[PDB]
Amino acid sequence: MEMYETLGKVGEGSYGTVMKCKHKNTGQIVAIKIFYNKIAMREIKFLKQFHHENLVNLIEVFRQKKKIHLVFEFIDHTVLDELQHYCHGLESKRLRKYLFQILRAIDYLHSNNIIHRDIKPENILVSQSGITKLCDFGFARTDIYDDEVATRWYRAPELVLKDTSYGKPVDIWALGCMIIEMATGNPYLPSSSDLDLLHKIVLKVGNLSPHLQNIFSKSPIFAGVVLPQVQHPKNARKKYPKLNGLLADIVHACLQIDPADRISSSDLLHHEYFTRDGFIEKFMPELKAKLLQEAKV
Amino acid sequence: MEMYETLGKVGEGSYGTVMKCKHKNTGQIVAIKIFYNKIAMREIKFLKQFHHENLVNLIEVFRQKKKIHLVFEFIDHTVLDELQHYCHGLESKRLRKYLFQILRAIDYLHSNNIIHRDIKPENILVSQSGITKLCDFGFARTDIYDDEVATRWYRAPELVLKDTSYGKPVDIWALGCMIIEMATGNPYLPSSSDLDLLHKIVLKVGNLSPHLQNIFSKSPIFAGVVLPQVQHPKNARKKYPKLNGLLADIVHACLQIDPADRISSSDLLHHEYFTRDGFIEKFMPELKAKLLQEAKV
Ligand SMILES: N#CCc1ccc(Nc2nccc(Nc3cc(C4CCCC4)n[nH]3)n2)cc1
Ligand SMILES: N#CCc1ccc(Nc2nccc(Nc3cc(C4CCCC4)n[nH]3)n2)cc1
Ligand code: NA
Ligand code: NA
Ligand SMILES: [Zn+2]
Ligand SMILES: [Zn+2]
Ligand SMILES: [Zn+2]
Ligand SMILES: [Zn+2]
Helix, strand or coil, rough: CEEEEEEEEEEECEEEEEEEEEEECCCCEEEEEEECCCCHHHHHHHHHHCCCCCCCEEEEEECCCCCCCCCEEEECCEHHHHHHHHCCCCCCHHHHHHHHHHHHHHHHHHHCCCECCCCHHEEEECCCCCCCCEECCCCECCCCCCCCCCHHCCCHHHHHCCCCCCCCCCHHHHHHHHHHHHCCCCHHHCCCCCHHHHHHHHHHHCCCCCCHHHHHHHHHHHHCCCCCCCCCCCCCCHHHCCHHHHHHHHHHHHHCCCHHCCCCHHHHCCCHHHCCCCCCHHHHHHHHHHHHHHHCC | CCCCCEEEEEEEECEEEEEEEEEEECEEEEEECCCCCCHHHHHCCCCCCCCCCCCEEEEEEECCCCEEEEEECCEEEEEHHHHHHCCCCCCHHHHHHHHHHHHHHHHHHHHHHEEECCCCCHHHHCCCCCEEEECCCCCEEECCCCHHHHHCCCCHHHCCCCCCCCCCCHHHHHHHHHHHHHHCCCCCCCCCHHHHHHHHHHHCCCCCCCCHHHHHHHHHHCCCCCCCCCCCCCCCHCCCCCCCCHHHHHHHCCCCHHHHHHCCCCHHHHHHHHHCCCHHHHHHHHHHHHHHHHHHH
């Protein structure tokens, strides 16, 4: 006997579905993920051990009609919603606040040696008061194939080339891509296939590092294929000239072809972008007080 | 006994594969489309009746290893190749020459009441001398579902909403999108789902026309969903301000939400964009003489 009034469908994928619902007794508004199973179980495994105030809350798990249901707290919208509803990207003060909270989340995970593996705008939830939370841990790890169209756009060059090892740096690449999109409103590496993606990476970001060039030139998927050979500015302000200067600096530090050249999440949190005008010192009390003032009501 | 030396793979889709090959006796370089069948047969049906100098030549058809093989002439590259290899889009003089020839092709088809149904950069072939040819007629008609990722980006709002009738105007919408991409280097409506696409159409182009709004608000796929409500400049130069003025004017005329408001292919060929400086009068002899000088050798 369904304990939930399904209210509407807010998502769907190769995996299944997210439904906005209302517990029949609680009256509580939830988001229920419903699959058709490794991925369900490893998401559950993760949410049992890991907790943070910029990660989404899991409430319960049931298995009605031979399917697994994951009830989460409901958060007003996503960053994808913002980019789909408003022109030209996020206002700059608001962008900074989102990014810091996104970074707090990613750093928490990276300190615990978790790779998220699916950073993108839909998986950033945004409450009405503007507290952001990270979600979707089905592919998180200490490779499971992610068949999703949007996911390709944020994939790092080592994932695209199927390098046998990869790690935390793939979350940093995806973040750098998302930052550009949140700043301009436009996805940076939109692509319709991996071959397309590889060309765009090389065209817009940089040539393959030697190891990745080696894997490319030995890969049978990509035989005959010669990549674009392109010069790029070495200066961040030049290379992303439509962005705020320090924002350009971060993006440059994220989008390095060689994963080992990418900035860590720790260092990103301490970047001049966030410390310039005492923002962290002003923001953290305002954050702690929201979560206070909201927790009471 | 394969009569062809397969040389390399230049394409692949939900349909099958394109291989660059060399006939073992002729030594002739070909592109062979290989399926796994309605779509094969309707492409063949089309290529038997229809012929033009800006459409790709079919040579023969065979059925080896329970599969259908369509041997075409081989053309150096595609417009997709150009956008994947070079920064910031096509040089303006070259863009104009491509578009005119693309339009000659589309108009030829529309005069014969054919809807192409899959205008996009990969399906524009470009020879070394820069003669362009249209290809891929599997979905051409006087709706078969097109499962391809890139295809979504060029789909008109009526296709997205599954309107029971649509026609020639969907080729004009797709062309307008492709023009923007060829001009800037960036796809205009990159999207990862139809819901995403609908938001971007409304955000960047215009609100749904009343009939399409009706279908949207009655559609079960899209229930609960409220689209972005957005004002757009009415002037073409303003609305696409990074384009050449007359090029902006064409794009505006293509990208009208109501298909019945879109410009015809006939009128596009006669636009000021092509007549301003006597270009058609200068271009057509240069075209006819290339095809002469090339036909001899
Ligand atoms: N997982 C996942 C991916 C996903 C994430 C968001 C959405 N769409 C969406 N769209 C609007 C609001 C919203 N609020 C929300 C969702 C959740 C859950 C975490 C996650 C599954 C419920 N909590 N609060 N989600 C759709 C898919
Ligand atoms: N059909 C179709 C779609 C398609 C079109 C082009 C390509 N890729 C490509 N990439 C580089 C060159 C090229 N030259 C070429 C292809 C053809 C055929 C018409 C069409 C099928 C062979 N003639 N000349 N095609 C891949 C797929
Ligand atoms: Na995911
Ligand atoms: Na096609
Ligand atoms: Zn929306
Ligand atoms: Zn390796
Ligand atoms: Zn290429
Ligand atoms: Zn209708």
